[PDB]
Protein backbone atom coordinates (compact mmCIF):
# COMPACT_ATOMS: atom_id res chain seq x y z
CA UNK A 1 0.00 0.00 0.00
CA UNK A 2 2.82 2.36 0.90
CA UNK A 3 4.93 1.50 -2.14
CA UNK A 4 1.95 2.15 -4.38
CA UNK A 5 1.44 5.55 -2.86
CA UNK A 6 5.07 6.42 -3.39
CA UNK A 7 5.09 5.15 -6.98
CA UNK A 8 2.01 7.23 -7.83
CA UNK A 9 3.54 10.28 -6.16
CA UNK A 10 6.71 9.81 -8.24
CA UNK A 11 4.69 10.09 -11.45
CA UNK B 1 37.26 28.68 2.64
CA UNK B 2 34.73 30.74 0.61
CA UNK B 3 35.46 29.28 -2.83
CA UNK B 4 33.55 27.73 -5.79
CA UNK B 5 33.08 24.41 -3.95
CA UNK B 6 31.71 25.95 -0.76
CA UNK B 7 29.47 28.35 -2.70
CA UNK B 8 28.08 25.30 -4.49
CA UNK B 9 27.26 23.71 -1.12
CA UNK B 10 25.56 26.89 0.07
CA UNK B 11 23.58 26.94 -3.16
CA UNK B 12 22.52 23.32 -2.58
CA UNK B 13 21.45 24.17 0.98
CA UNK B 14 19.35 27.07 -0.32
CA UNK B 15 17.82 24.96 -3.10
CA UNK B 16 16.84 22.28 -0.57
CA UNK B 17 15.50 24.85 1.90
CA UNK B 18 13.38 26.50 -0.80
CA UNK B 19 12.01 23.13 -1.90
CA UNK B 20 11.45 22.20 1.75
CA UNK B 21 9.32 25.30 2.32
CA UNK B 22 7.33 24.59 -0.85
CA UNK B 23 6.76 20.92 0.06
CA UNK B 24 6.02 21.10 3.81
CA UNK B 25 3.45 23.65 5.02
CA UNK B 26 3.92 22.34 8.60
CA UNK B 27 7.35 23.76 9.43
CA UNK B 28 9.24 23.55 12.69
CA UNK B 29 8.98 27.31 13.24
CA UNK B 30 5.18 27.17 12.98
CA UNK B 31 4.99 24.29 15.47
CA UNK B 32 7.27 25.93 18.04
CA UNK B 33 5.31 29.18 17.83
CA UNK B 34 2.18 27.27 18.87
CA UNK B 35 3.96 25.26 21.58
CA UNK B 36 5.47 28.33 23.24
CA UNK B 37 2.07 30.04 23.21
CA UNK B 38 3.11 32.69 20.67
CA UNK B 39 0.15 32.24 18.32
CA UNK B 40 -3.02 33.86 19.64
CA UNK B 41 -4.89 32.62 16.52
CA UNK B 42 -7.11 30.06 18.41
CA UNK B 43 -4.67 28.66 20.98
CA UNK B 44 -4.69 24.87 21.48
CA UNK B 45 -6.85 23.22 24.12
CA UNK B 46 -4.87 21.08 26.60
CA UNK B 47 -6.05 17.48 27.09
CA UNK B 48 -4.41 16.21 30.27
CA UNK B 49 -6.84 13.65 31.75
CA UNK B 50 -10.11 11.88 31.03
CA UNK B 51 -12.20 14.86 32.16
CA UNK B 52 -10.44 17.40 29.93
CA UNK B 53 -10.57 14.81 27.14
CA UNK B 54 -14.36 14.94 27.25
CA UNK B 55 -14.39 18.72 27.59
CA UNK B 56 -12.20 18.68 24.51
CA UNK B 57 -14.70 16.89 22.10
CA UNK B 58 -13.21 19.00 19.05
CA UNK B 59 -11.82 16.01 17.06
CA UNK B 60 -10.34 -4.87 13.58
CA UNK B 61 -8.82 -4.61 17.03
CA UNK B 62 -8.46 -1.12 18.49
CA UNK B 63 -4.69 -0.84 18.05
CA UNK B 64 -4.79 -2.13 14.47
CA UNK B 65 -7.47 0.36 13.50
CA UNK B 66 -5.40 3.12 15.11
CA UNK B 67 -2.44 2.12 12.91
CA UNK B 68 -4.65 1.86 9.83
CA UNK B 69 -5.95 5.35 10.55
CA UNK B 70 -2.61 7.04 11.21
CA UNK B 71 -1.10 5.40 8.14
CA UNK B 72 -4.01 6.69 6.04
CA UNK B 73 -3.72 10.19 7.52
CA UNK B 74 0.02 10.07 6.68
CA UNK B 75 -0.61 9.70 2.95
CA UNK B 76 -0.33 13.47 2.49
CA UNK B 77 2.98 13.55 4.36
CA UNK B 78 4.31 10.68 2.21
CA UNK B 79 3.30 12.61 -0.89
CA UNK B 80 4.99 15.76 0.41
CA UNK B 81 8.20 13.87 1.21
CA UNK B 82 8.19 12.27 -2.25
CA UNK B 83 7.71 15.71 -3.83
CA UNK B 84 10.65 16.96 -1.77
CA UNK B 85 12.80 14.02 -2.87
CA UNK B 86 12.21 14.94 -6.53
CA UNK B 87 13.96 18.25 -5.81
CA UNK B 88 17.12 16.54 -4.53
CA UNK B 89 19.62 16.84 -7.41
CA UNK B 90 20.21 13.43 -8.91
CA UNK B 91 17.39 11.59 -7.13
CA UNK B 92 15.01 11.21 -10.07
CA UNK B 93 17.90 9.90 -12.20
CA UNK B 94 18.26 6.84 -9.96
CA UNK B 95 16.61 3.57 -10.92
CA UNK B 96 12.90 3.93 -10.17
CA UNK B 97 12.91 0.85 -7.92
CA UNK B 98 15.68 2.37 -5.81
CA UNK B 99 13.76 5.67 -5.56
CA UNK B 100 10.81 3.70 -4.20
CA UNK B 101 12.99 1.72 -1.79
CA UNK B 102 14.68 4.89 -0.52
CA UNK B 103 11.32 6.57 0.10
CA UNK B 104 9.58 3.51 1.53
CA UNK B 105 12.07 3.37 4.40
CA UNK B 106 12.86 7.07 4.65
CA UNK B 107 9.29 8.36 5.00
CA UNK B 108 8.74 6.84 8.44
CA UNK B 109 11.96 8.34 9.78
CA UNK B 110 11.08 11.75 8.32
CA UNK B 111 7.55 11.61 9.75
CA UNK B 112 9.08 11.03 13.20
CA UNK B 113 11.53 13.91 12.65
CA UNK B 114 8.62 16.22 11.91
CA UNK B 115 6.57 14.79 14.78
CA UNK B 116 9.37 15.95 17.11
CA UNK B 117 8.63 19.52 16.02
CA UNK B 118 5.10 19.06 17.44
CA UNK B 119 6.48 17.75 20.77
CA UNK B 120 7.91 19.20 23.91
CA UNK B 121 8.61 17.56 27.25
CA UNK B 122 4.97 18.21 28.31
CA UNK B 123 3.06 16.77 25.32
CA UNK B 124 2.26 16.89 21.61
CA UNK B 125 0.15 19.04 19.28
CA UNK B 126 -2.86 17.31 17.74
CA UNK B 127 -5.93 18.16 15.66
CA UNK B 128 -3.93 20.40 13.31
CA UNK B 129 -2.76 22.54 16.22
CA UNK B 130 -6.16 22.82 17.94
CA UNK B 131 -5.28 20.46 20.79
CA UNK B 132 -2.34 19.54 22.99
CA UNK B 133 -2.22 15.99 24.38
CA UNK B 134 0.00 15.65 27.42
CA UNK B 135 2.83 13.17 27.54
CA UNK B 136 1.93 11.86 30.98
CA UNK B 137 -1.74 11.37 30.06
CA UNK B 138 -0.64 9.25 27.08
CA UNK B 139 1.77 7.31 29.30
CA UNK B 140 -0.99 6.66 31.87
CA UNK B 141 -3.23 4.82 29.42
CA UNK B 142 -3.83 1.10 29.81
CA UNK B 143 -1.40 -1.32 28.23
CA UNK B 144 -0.39 -1.56 25.47
CA UNK B 145 -1.46 2.01 24.56
CA UNK B 146 0.49 3.67 27.38
CA UNK B 147 3.83 2.62 25.82
CA UNK B 148 3.02 3.76 22.26
CA UNK B 149 4.33 7.31 22.36
CA UNK B 150 6.80 7.56 25.26
CA UNK B 151 9.91 6.47 23.26
CA UNK B 152 9.05 9.11 20.68
CA UNK B 153 8.90 11.76 23.43
CA UNK B 154 12.28 10.58 24.74
CA UNK B 155 13.71 10.98 21.24
CA UNK B 156 11.99 14.31 20.59
CA UNK B 157 13.21 16.04 23.76
CA UNK B 158 16.82 15.12 22.96
CA UNK B 159 16.41 15.93 19.26
CA UNK B 160 14.79 19.31 19.97
CA UNK B 161 17.62 20.20 22.34
CA UNK B 162 19.88 20.32 19.27
CA UNK B 163 17.85 23.44 18.32
CA UNK B 164 17.84 22.69 14.60
CA UNK B 165 15.90 25.09 12.40
CA UNK B 166 14.09 24.44 9.14
CA UNK B 167 17.23 25.32 7.13
CA UNK B 168 19.06 22.55 9.00
CA UNK B 169 16.17 20.07 8.79
CA UNK B 170 15.92 20.48 5.01
CA UNK B 171 19.40 19.01 4.54
CA UNK B 172 19.06 16.48 7.37
CA UNK B 173 15.92 15.05 5.75
CA UNK B 174 17.65 14.82 2.36
CA UNK B 175 20.50 12.91 4.01
CA UNK B 176 17.95 10.47 5.48
CA UNK B 177 16.38 9.83 2.08
CA UNK B 178 19.72 9.15 0.37
CA UNK B 179 20.64 6.33 2.79
CA UNK B 180 22.62 3.76 0.85
CA UNK B 181 22.16 0.99 3.44
CA UNK B 182 18.46 0.33 2.80
CA UNK B 183 17.62 -3.34 2.19
CA UNK B 184 17.00 -4.19 -1.44
CA UNK B 185 18.90 -1.33 -3.08
CA UNK B 186 20.21 -2.20 -6.56
CA UNK B 187 22.78 0.54 -7.29
CA UNK B 188 24.24 1.79 -4.02
CA UNK B 189 27.12 3.87 -5.43
CA UNK B 190 25.08 6.65 -7.15
CA UNK B 191 23.04 6.94 -3.95
CA UNK B 192 26.14 7.32 -1.79
CA UNK B 193 27.56 9.84 -4.27
CA UNK B 194 24.49 12.03 -3.72
CA UNK B 195 24.46 11.46 0.03
CA UNK B 196 28.15 12.36 0.26
CA UNK B 197 27.43 15.70 -1.38
CA UNK B 198 24.46 16.25 0.93
CA UNK B 199 26.66 15.37 3.92
CA UNK B 200 29.22 17.96 2.82
CA UNK B 201 26.41 20.51 2.56
CA UNK B 202 25.14 19.53 6.00
CA UNK B 203 28.60 19.79 7.61
CA UNK B 204 29.00 23.32 6.25
CA UNK B 205 25.46 24.33 7.20
CA UNK B 206 25.96 23.24 10.81
CA UNK B 207 29.31 25.06 11.06
CA UNK B 208 27.76 28.29 9.80
CA UNK B 209 24.51 28.01 11.79
CA UNK B 210 25.61 26.40 15.09
CA UNK B 211 28.78 27.93 16.55
CA UNK B 212 27.74 26.66 19.99
CA UNK B 213 27.69 22.94 19.14
CA UNK B 214 30.92 21.07 18.65
CA UNK B 215 30.24 17.60 17.20
CA UNK B 216 26.69 18.62 16.18
CA UNK B 217 27.27 16.91 12.81
CA UNK B 218 28.11 13.65 14.58
CA UNK B 219 25.28 14.13 17.10
CA UNK B 220 22.80 14.61 14.29
CA UNK B 221 24.05 11.49 12.47
CA UNK B 222 23.55 9.57 15.73
CA UNK B 223 19.92 10.73 15.63
CA UNK B 224 19.46 8.85 12.37
CA UNK B 225 20.39 5.78 14.48
CA UNK B 226 17.62 6.63 16.99
CA UNK B 227 15.04 7.20 14.25
CA UNK B 228 15.55 3.73 12.79
CA UNK B 229 15.18 2.10 16.17
CA UNK B 230 11.89 3.93 16.76
CA UNK B 231 10.63 2.58 13.44
CA UNK B 232 11.79 -0.98 14.12
CA UNK B 233 10.22 -0.84 17.60
CA UNK B 234 6.85 -0.83 15.81
CA UNK B 235 7.40 -4.49 14.88
CA UNK B 236 7.80 -5.30 18.58
CA UNK B 237 4.71 -3.25 19.41
CA UNK B 238 2.64 -5.33 16.98
CA UNK B 239 3.78 -8.55 18.67
CA UNK B 240 3.00 -7.09 22.11
CA UNK B 241 -0.42 -6.27 20.85
CA UNK B 242 -1.13 -9.71 19.54
CA UNK B 243 -0.09 -11.30 22.81
CA UNK B 244 -2.10 -8.91 24.97
CA UNK B 245 -4.77 -10.76 26.85
CA UNK B 246 -6.04 -7.93 28.94
CA UNK B 247 -8.79 -5.53 27.86
CA UNK B 248 -7.72 -3.29 25.02
CA UNK B 249 -10.77 -1.05 24.84
CA UNK B 250 -9.99 2.63 24.38
CA UNK B 251 -12.12 5.76 24.54
CA UNK B 252 -13.18 6.72 20.98
CA UNK B 253 -11.71 10.21 21.42
CA UNK B 254 -8.37 8.65 22.43
CA UNK B 255 -8.48 6.43 19.33
CA UNK B 256 -9.03 9.55 17.22
CA UNK B 257 -6.13 11.33 18.92
CA UNK B 258 -3.81 8.36 18.35
CA UNK B 259 -4.73 8.37 14.64
CA UNK B 260 -3.21 11.89 14.60
CA UNK B 261 0.11 10.52 15.93
CA UNK B 262 2.64 7.97 14.63
C1 LIG C 1 -0.02 5.37 13.97
C2 LIG C 1 -0.61 6.05 15.04
C3 LIG C 1 -0.10 5.91 16.32
C4 LIG C 1 0.99 5.10 16.54
N5 LIG C 1 1.53 4.95 17.87
O6 LIG C 1 0.96 5.69 18.92
O7 LIG C 1 2.44 4.23 18.06
C8 LIG C 1 1.58 4.42 15.50
C9 LIG C 1 1.07 4.56 14.22
C10 LIG C 1 1.79 3.77 13.11
O11 LIG C 1 1.21 3.04 12.36
N12 LIG C 1 3.21 4.01 13.09
C13 LIG C 1 4.17 3.41 12.18
C14 LIG C 1 3.80 2.89 10.95
C15 LIG C 1 4.75 2.32 10.12
C16 LIG C 1 6.07 2.27 10.50
C17 LIG C 1 6.45 2.81 11.72
C18 LIG C 1 5.50 3.37 12.56
Q: Pairing relation of β-strands B123-126 and B131-134?
A: antiparallel
| Distance separating alpha carbons of residues B63 and B144, to the nearest angstrom | 9
Q: Could you tell me if B108 and B231 are in contact, meaning their C-beta atoms sit under 8 angstroms apart?
A: yes
Q: Strand order of the sheet with strand B131-134?
A: B45-47, B131-134, B123-126, B119-120
- What is the distance, to the nearest Å, from the Cα of residue B125 to the centroid of all Cα atoms in its chain? 13
For the range B29-37, what are the long-range contacts, defined as Cβ-Cβ under 8 Å and sequence gap of 24 or more?
B29/B165, B29/B166, B31/B117, B31/B118, B31/B125, B31/B129, B32/B117, B34/B125, B34/B129, B35/B118, B35/B120, B35/B125, B35/B132
Q: Nearest by CB to A9, which of B71, B83, B96?
A: B83
Most B CBs within 10 Å, among A1, A2, A11, to test the B interface:
A2
Q: Could you tell me if B147 and B136 are in contact, meaning their C-beta atoms sit under 8 angstroms apart?
A: no
Structural domain for B110, as ranges? 5-261
Alpha-carbon Rg for chain B, nearest whole angstrom, is: 19
Q: How many domains does the structure of chain B reveal?
A: 1
Q: Could you tell me if B152 and B115 are in contact, meaning their C-beta atoms sit under 8 angstroms apart?
A: yes
Residue (of B101, B74, B79) closest to B23 by Cα position? B79
Q: Could you tell me if B131 and B143 are in contact, meaning their C-beta atoms sit under 8 angstroms apart?
A: no
Question: Which CATH number covers residue B96?
Answer: 1.10.565.10
For B200, residues 6+ apart whose C-beta sits below 8 A from its C-beta are: B9
Entry field: residues in chain A: 11
B78/A10 touch (CB, cutoff 8 Å), yes or no: no
Q: Could you tell me if B81 and B110 are in contact, meaning their C-beta atoms sit under 8 angstroms apart?
A: yes
Q: Does B73 appear as a known binding residue?
A: yes
Q: Measured between CA atoms, how close is A5 to chain B, in angstroms?
A: 7
Q: Measured between CA atoms, how close is B75 to chain A, in angstroms?
A: 7
Q: According to the entry, how was the structure determined? A: X-ray
Tell me, what DSSP letter sits at residue B154?
A: H
Amino acid sequence: GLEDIIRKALM
Amino acid sequence: QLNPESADLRALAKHLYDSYIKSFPLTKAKARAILTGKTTDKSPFVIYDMNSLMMGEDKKEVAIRIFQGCQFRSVEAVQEITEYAKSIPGFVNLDLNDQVTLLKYGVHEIIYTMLASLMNKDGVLISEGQGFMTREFLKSLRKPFGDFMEPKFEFAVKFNALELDDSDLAIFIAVIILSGDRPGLLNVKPIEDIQDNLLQALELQLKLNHPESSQLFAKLLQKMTDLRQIVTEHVQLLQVIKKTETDMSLHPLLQEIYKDLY
